[PDB]
From Swiss-Prot, chain A:
GO CC terms, sorted: cytoplasm; cytosol; eukaryotic translation initiation factor 2B complex; membrane; plasma membrane
Leader sequence segment: none
Disease implication from the record: Leukoencephalopathy with vanishing white matter 1: An autosomal recessive brain disease characterized by neurological features including progressive cerebellar ataxia, spasticity, and cognitive deficits. Brain imaging shows abnormal white matter that vanishes over time and is replaced by cerebrospinal fluid. Disease severity ranges from fatal infantile forms to adult forms without neurological deterioration. The disease is progressive with, in most individuals, additional episodes of rapid deterioration following febrile infections or minor head trauma.
Principal place of residence: cytoplasm
Descriptive protein name: Translation initiation factor eIF2B subunit alpha
Entry-linked PANTHER family: TRANSLATION INITIATION FACTOR EIF-2B SUBUNIT ALPHA
UniProtKB/Swiss-Prot annotation, chain B:
Record: disease: Leukoencephalopathy with vanishing white matter 4: An autosomal recessive brain disease characterized by neurological features including progressive cerebellar ataxia, spasticity, and cognitive deficits. Brain imaging shows abnormal white matter that vanishes over time and is replaced by cerebrospinal fluid. Disease severity ranges from fatal infantile forms to adult forms without neurological deterioration. The disease is progressive with, in most individuals, additional episodes of rapid deterioration following febrile infections or minor head trauma.
Family: Belongs to the eIF-2B alpha/beta/delta subunits family.
Name of this chain's protein: Translation initiation factor eIF2B subunit delta
Subunit-structure text: Component of the translation initiation factor 2B (eIF2B) complex which is a heterodecamer of two sets of five different subunits: alpha, beta, gamma, delta and epsilon. Subunits alpha, beta and delta comprise a regulatory subcomplex and subunits epsilon and gamma comprise a catalytic subcomplex. Within the complex, the hexameric regulatory complex resides at the center, with the two heterodimeric catalytic subcomplexes bound on opposite sides.
Gene designation: EIF2B4
Domain of life, source organism: Eukaryota
Function: Acts as a component of the translation initiation factor 2B (eIF2B) complex, which catalyzes the exchange of GDP for GTP on eukaryotic initiation factor 2 (eIF2) gamma subunit. Its guanine nucleotide exchange factor activity is repressed when bound to eIF2 complex phosphorylated on the alpha subunit, thereby limiting the amount of methionyl-initiator methionine tRNA available to the ribosome and consequently global translation is repressed.
Subcellular location as annotated: Cytoplasm, Cytosol
Disulfide partners: none
């Protein structure tokens, strides 16, 4: 499989279904690459998959793509540990990959059904920018016949907050748009903050759009619960010590304008994943359980 | 009088004022004139420091009370009751949450007042306060004394309410007349306090009193604290006849009232 057709398949699966996220598209492209590789050794298989992951992360500078890459490499490593013969291992891999794709396709609805019960009637929800998982949880909460008012931040560098407001008014949910600088002004009117995450780091913190850290610190200062809804495949084994420790491949190209920031686990109340409702300390355990 | 019961801060300030006024009486002054002037000075002190001060504090607090807000009060305070009554009379519409504590249960007094004024009211004990603070918008607390460092000396449990209100992002307002301002400082409730009668802690639960004959147990002790101290960091605003000030401005008032 050529590099050009790899990028073409990635872009085609991203464009065909805008609802589906970037990490799922990357994992699908990697599984499609593994589908037709015409190889005979698992060593070259691993090397080719790693190179495909590097070029895919070259296409998109998101943390979720790299998360999916490491998760997929671990999946191949475990499958190889199960079976030594290349043909049996490869067929086991393709069936397991199909099951994995099926399970990660429906994570959003599980997170919605597990998180919509934390919204109360007459609550005031603050969210940062556009995130399909937050849209899904709010849709499920509305389907639960609950009435609430949503606040959203315009998300200045690309106005995805306005897109969130439009996609929320589509279902006639009362929503409001505030500036990036008005977040500290709005915290006291909101009851809880719900955000997504492009990547969940080892210690339980998150990587997200540049304005997430401000909301986390403001909510902590005003004693408001901070909920993060994120998928399992966004679990990177990263340990940022500060904002400078975040890898530069995720900050830029996605005066000086970073596109992401890191939020410490002490500023997060609970994480809503397809694994369930977890404390941040659980996430690390998961990773420790994954890599032996 | 101190032997009958330890003197309060207001009584201490009144004693200071009366001693200063008696010392200021000249020797050449006639005895009848001196006595009449002393009585008139006491009457004027009562008037200015209580009645006009309460009216000014009510007018000041009217601007901080809006329609549809929930105000939390603790125990019994004449200033708080007057503030709420005049706020309701002038046309503000709101509801009040009354918090009470054992064994005095003075909050019931305030409750009755509110019921006789037409103000909607709720009643609960202090341990349940954290349950009701989510729906509370402002906390209005009376003060027995304001200390030179900004701390609020009040009925035991007031600092509890201030801490729990800060935990719920609820502003805490203290109303106090400037004649209750004290030059002394106090960091905790142990160094200076009052011990009430321990037998008041006995309560009839079911058909037996568990604390009956509690002195028969050598290692058993009963503690009945009267006062506690609220640090200035737990108070958002002080309402006085001078106006709305921060706690850090309490010494400033003490500077301008003295001279």
């Amino acid at each position: 499989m050529d590099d050009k057709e790899l990028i073409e398949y990635f872009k085609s699966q991203m464009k065909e279904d805008p609802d589906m996220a970037s990490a799922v598209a990357a994992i699908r492209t990697l599984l499609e690459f593994l589908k037709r590789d015409k190889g005979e050794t698992i060593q070259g298989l691993r090397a080719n998959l790693t190179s495909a992951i590097e070029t895919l992360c070259g296409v998109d500078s998101s943390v979720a793509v790299s998360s999916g890459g490491e998760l997929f490499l671990r999946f191949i490593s475990l499958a190889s540990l199960e079976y030594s013969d290349y043909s049996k291992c490869k067929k086991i891999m393709i069936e397991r990959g199909e099951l994995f794709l099926r399970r990660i396709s429906l994570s959003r609805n599980k997170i919605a059904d597990l998180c919509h019960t934390f919204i109360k009637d007459g609550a005031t929800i603050l969210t940062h920018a556009y995130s399909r998982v937050v849209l899904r949880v709010l849709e499920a909460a509305v389907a639960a016949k609950k009435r609430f008012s949503v606040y959203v931040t315009e998300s200045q560098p690309d106005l995805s907050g306005k897109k969130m407001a439009k996609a929320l008014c589509h279902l006639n949910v009362p929503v409001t748009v505030v500036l990036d600088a008005a977040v500290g002004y709005i915290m006291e009117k909101a009851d809880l903050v719900i955000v997504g995450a492009e990547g969940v780091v080892e210690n339980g913190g998150i990587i997200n759009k540049i304005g997430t850290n401000q909301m986390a610190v403001c909510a902590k200062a005003q004693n408001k619960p901070f909920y993060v809804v994120a998928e399992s495949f966004k679990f990177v084994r990263l340990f940022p010590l500060n904002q400078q420790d975040v890898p530069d491949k995720f900050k830029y190209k996605a005066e000086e304008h970073p596109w992401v920031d890191y939020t410490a686990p002490s500023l997060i109340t609970l994480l809503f994943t397809d694994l369930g409702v977890l404390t941040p300390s659980a996430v690390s355990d998961e990773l420790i359980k994954l890599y032996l | 009088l101190t032997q009958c019961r330890p003197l309060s801060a207001s009584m201490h300030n009144a004693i200071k004022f009366l001693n200063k006024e008696i010392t200021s009486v000249g020797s050449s002054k006639r005895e009848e004139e001196a006595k009449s002037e002393l009585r008139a000075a006491i009457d004027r002190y009562v008037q200015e420091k209580i009645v006009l001060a309460a009216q000014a504090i009510s007018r000041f607090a009217y601007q901080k009370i809006s329609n549809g807000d929930v105000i939390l009060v603790y125990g019994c305070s004449s200033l708080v009751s007057r503030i709420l009554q005049e706020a309701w009379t002038e046309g503000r519409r709101f509801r009040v949450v009354v918090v009470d504590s054992r064994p005095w249960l003075e909050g019931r007094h305030t409750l009755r007042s509110l019921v006789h004024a037409g103000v909607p009211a709720s009643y609960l004990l202090i341990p349940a306060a954290s349950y009701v603070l989510p729906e509370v918008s402002k906390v209005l607390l009376g003060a027995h004394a304001l200390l030179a460092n900004g701390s609020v000396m009040s009925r035991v449990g007031t600092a509890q309410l201030a801490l729990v209100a800060r935990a719920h992002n609820v502003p805490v307002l203290v109303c106090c007349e400037t004649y209750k301002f004290c030059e002394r400082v106090q960091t905790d409730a142990f160094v200076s306090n009052e011990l009430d009668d321990p037998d008041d802690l006995q309560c009839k639960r079911g058909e037996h009193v568990a604390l009956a004959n509690w002195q028969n147990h050598a290692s058993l002790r009963l503690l009945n604290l009267v006062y506690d101290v609220t640090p200035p960091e737990l108070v958002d605003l002080v309402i006085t006849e001078l106006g709305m000030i921060p706690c850090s401005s309490v010494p400033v008032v003490l500077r301008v009232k003295s001279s």
